[PDB]
From Swiss-Prot:
Function: Inhibits host translation by associating with the open head conformation of the 40S subunit. The C-terminus binds to and obstructs ribosomal mRNA entry tunnel. Thereby inhibits antiviral response triggered by innate immunity or interferons. The nsp1-40S ribosome complex further induces an endonucleolytic cleavage near the 5'UTR of host mRNAs, targeting them for degradation. This inhibits the integrated stress response (ISR) in the infected cell by preventing EIF2S1/eIF2-alpha phosphorylation upstream of stress granule formation and depletes host G3BP1.
Organism: Severe acute respiratory syndrome coronavirus 2 (2019-nCoV)
Stretch list, region Disordered: 1-113
Record's subcellular location: Host cytoplasm
Residue span(s) of domain CoV Nsp1 globular: 2-113
Tree of life domain: Viruses
Entire protein: shown range: 11 to 125 of 7096
Protein name: Host translation inhibitor nsp1
Length: 113
């Protein structure tokens, strides 16, 4: 399937134990996609002071369309030193590994895979 229905645990930035997916744009996009597939991916909502607490390169989910079965259609865009790899809509948040942090909410997305 070109799209997969996922429910992403929304984590508080200060709870996150593993603050990024790796060391290159290509690695973080790779790792993000693997964790999304394996159900080991969390979402941090971006506000003032969040991103400097996480590790670059960042992986964002961005709205790719204006929402089947409650699931917002999203795609992945990486960012490193202010350059983005991909072009998409509004940021829903930054992806991080999930290693058992308690979420505050779930974000239903339809991920272009």
């Amino acid at each position: 399937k070109t799209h997969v229905q996922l429910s992403l645990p929304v984590l508080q930035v200060r709870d996150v134990l593993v603050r990024g997916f790796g060391d290159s744009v290509e690695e973080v996009l790779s790792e993000a996609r693997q964790h999304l597939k394996d159900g080991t991916c969390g979402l941090v909502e971006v506000e003032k002071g969040v991103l400097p607490q996480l590790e670059q390169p960042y992986v964002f989910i961005k709205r790719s369309d204006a929402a089947p079965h409650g699931h917002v259609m999203v795609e992945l865009v990486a960012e490193l030193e202010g350059i983005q790899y991909g072009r998409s809509g509004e940021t829903l948040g930054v992806l991080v590994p999930h290693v058992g942090e308690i979420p505050v909410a779930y974000r239903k997305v339809l991920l272009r895979k």
